[PDB]
C-alpha cells in the first residue's frame, strides 16, 4: 500500500522521538519499486524487520539470502550493532534483496575507518557485487500495437 | 487584522508557474511568507483514434494536460486584509495563472 | 478414518434411491451420484443426522443409513434453511420441498407441458431445438 518515497517512511517518524535521536547512521537500499530504510545504533546486537525478528521473515527459503551480509563476514562487528529496518514496496523477493543491501551498506558505514571499510568493500563485492551497488533495470512500458512490451497481436496475412 | 488566509496558484505551464512564485516570495520577504507545498501533478489523459473513419493500422493519439499548483497558506492572519490587497497588486500580471484566496 | 483393516460389516456396494454407491469412496462425495444430491446438500444433511463425513462409505451402518433417509425426505422439519432446497418453491403446492431421483424426471417434463398449452415464447424455442436464454445462434454451438 505504501509508495516507498513517503516522507513518513523516509524519516521513520513512526518511531517515537526520544528513541529517534539515538539512531545515528542512516542507510538505504532498493531493488524494484521497493525502498528499505535502516537505522543503526551500537548495542548488544540484534536486527528487526517491519517489527519482526530477522530470523522469522517469511520467504523462509530465502533466510540465508537475507542473512548473507552477516555470515559472509564474522559476527564480531555485527555483535555491537542493532538495526530497526523498515521496508515497503512491491514484492516479497524485492523487499528481501533491498533489505540485505541496506544491511550491507549500514554495516559498512558504521566501521568509521576508511581503510578497513575498503577492505570490507573488497571482501563483500568479490561475492555478489549487487550487495552494495544497486540494480538498475526496471519495468518498461507497453505500446498500443501489441498487448505487451514487445509482443505484438497475432497478424493474419490472409 | 488576522484571518488565517490562504493563497493558491493553479496553472499548466511550468515556466511561468515557477517564475511567479519567486516574485510572490519576494513580495512576502518581510511578511513571513515561506515555502509553498507543491502538489503531485494532475496529469489528465485522453486517447483517441487518429483516423476519423477507422481505416488501416490502428493507431492512437496520446494527449495529456498537466495541472501544476502551489499553495502559500503561510500568510494566514500574519497579514492584514489591508495589504492582502497589496499582496495581490505588486505581483506581476500573468495572462493565465489562476489564483484564489480563502481563510 | 483411523481404519486400516476393513469393518466386519463392510458393505462393499451400497444402494439407495435405485442408485448404487461403491463402498470405497469418501462418504460425502460418493452420495453425489444421486441425482438431486450435491455436495452442499450432502455435508449439511449428514451433519444434522450425526454422521462422520470423512469416513469411507463402506463403514456406515443401517441405523445411520436410515437416519439419513429421514432427513432426506422431510428436511425442513430438521432446521435446514428454506433458501437451500433445490425447489425453493412449487407451483401447485405453493410450499418448499426437495425432490429426488425417483421424481426428478417429472420436474422439467411436466414443466414443459405447462409451457406448451399456454403457447408461451419459451416453450416454442424448446420444441424446435433452440436456445432458451438470450443467446446468439448465428455462429455459436454449430451442430
Amino acid at each position: 500500500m505504501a509508495k516507498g518515497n513517503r516522507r513518513d517512511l523516509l524519516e521513520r517518524n513512526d518511531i517515537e522521538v526520544r528513541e529517534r535521536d539515538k539512531y545515528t547512521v542512516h542507510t538505504l537500499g532498493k531493488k524494484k519499486n521497493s525502498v528499505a530504510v535502516a537505522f543503526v545504533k551500537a548495542g548488544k546486537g540484534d536486527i528487526l524487520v517491519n517489527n519482526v525478528p530477522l530470523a522469522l521473515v517469511r520467504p523462509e527459503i530465502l533466510r540465508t539470502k537475507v542473512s548473507e551480509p552477516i555470515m559472509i563476514l564474522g559476527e564480531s562487528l555485527f555483535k555491537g550493532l542493532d538495526m530497526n529496518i523498515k521496508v515497503a514496496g512491491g514484492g516479497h523477493v524485492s523487499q528481501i534483496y533491498a533489505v540485505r543491501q541496506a544491511i550491507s551498506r549500514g554495516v559498512l558505514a558504521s566501521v568509521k575507518d576508511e581503510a578497513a571499510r575498503s577492505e570490507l568493500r573488497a571482501k563483500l563485492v568479490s561475492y555478489d557485487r549487487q550487495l552494495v551497488v544497486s540494480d538498475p533495470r526496471r519495468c518498461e512500458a507497453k505500446k498500443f500495437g501489441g498487448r505487451g512490451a514487445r509482443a505484438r497481436r497475432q497478424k493474419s496475412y490472409r | 487584522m488576522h484571518q488565517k488566509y490562504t493563497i493558491i496558484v493553479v496553472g499548466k505551464d511550468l515556466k511561468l508557474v515557477e517564475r511567479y512564485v519567486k516574485s510572490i516570495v519576494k513580495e512576502g520577504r518581510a511578511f513571513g511568507i515561506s515555502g509553498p507545498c507543491r502538489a503531485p501533478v494532475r496529469r489528465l489523459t485522453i486517447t483517441t483514434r487518429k483516423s476519423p473513419c477507422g481505416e488501416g493500422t490502428n493507431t492512437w493519439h496520446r494527449f495529456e494536460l498537466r495541472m501544476y499548483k502551489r499553495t502559500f497558506w503561510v500568510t494566514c492572519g500574519g497579514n492584514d486584509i489591508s495589504t492582502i490587497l497589496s499582496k495581490t497588486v505588486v505581483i506581476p500580471g500573468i495572462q493565465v495563472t489562476v489564483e484564489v484566496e480563502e481563510p | 478414518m483411523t481404519t486400516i483393516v476393513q469393518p466386519n460389516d463392510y458393505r462393499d456396494l451400497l444402494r439407495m434411491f435405485n442408485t448404487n454407491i461403491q463402498g470405497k469412496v469418501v462418504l460425502e462425495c460418493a452420495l453425489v451420484g444421486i441425482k438431486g444430491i450435491g455436495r452442499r446438500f450432502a455435508n449439511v444433511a449428514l451433519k444434522k443426522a450425526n454422521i462422520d463425513v470423512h469416513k469411507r462409505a463402506g463403514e456406515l451402518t443401517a441405523a445411520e443409513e436410515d437416519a439419513l433417509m429421514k432427513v432426506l425426505e422431510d428436511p425442513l422439519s430438521h432446521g435446514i434453511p428454506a433458501w437451500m432446497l433445490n425447489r425453493n418453491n412449487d407451483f401447485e403446492s405453493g410450499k418448499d420441498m426437495h425432490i429426488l431421483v425417483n421424481t426428478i424426471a417429472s420436474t422439467h417434463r411436466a414443466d414443459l407441458e405447462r409451457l406448451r398449452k399456454t403457447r408461451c415464447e419459451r416453450g416454442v424455442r424448446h420444441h424446435h431445438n433452440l436456445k432458451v436464454r438470450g443467446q446468439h445462434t448465428k455462429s455459436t454451438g454449430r451442430r
Binding site: - | - | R39, K48, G79, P81
Partner: protein
Amino acid sequence: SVTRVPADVFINSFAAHLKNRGIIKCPAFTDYVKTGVSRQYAPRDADWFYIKAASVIRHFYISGSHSIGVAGLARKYSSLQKGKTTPHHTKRASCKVIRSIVSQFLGQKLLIAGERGRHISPNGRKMVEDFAEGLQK
C-alpha cells in the same frame, strides 16, 4: 510479545484456550455456511470459528490505536472466484460471521468502541501478550 512468535502456533493455541474458557460460543448458523461467495464448498474442520476469531484478535492487536471496520477485515479474507469460462475476478468474504465475532468480543470488554469501528482495549492487549509469553517458552 506476539510479534516474536509466528502466527501458526499462536493462532491455534489461542483458539484452543478460547474454546476451553468459553469466551466465544459458536452460533447455530455455523452449521451451513460457506464463508464468502468466492468459495464453493464449506469448511472441512469443525472449529473454524475459533481460528477465525483468534486471527481477528491478533489483527486488532497489530493495529494498535488504529481502528478496523467490519468490512475492512472482510477484504483480508478475500479469495478468487473460479469456474465461469471468464477471467477470474476477486471477491470479498462474508461480513456476518465477522460481525458476530466482534460483537462476542466486545460483550467481553476486550474490544473498545471508537469513532469509526473499534480497537483493542487495554485489557485485551494484556491478555494477548499474556498468552504470547505463556506460549513463547
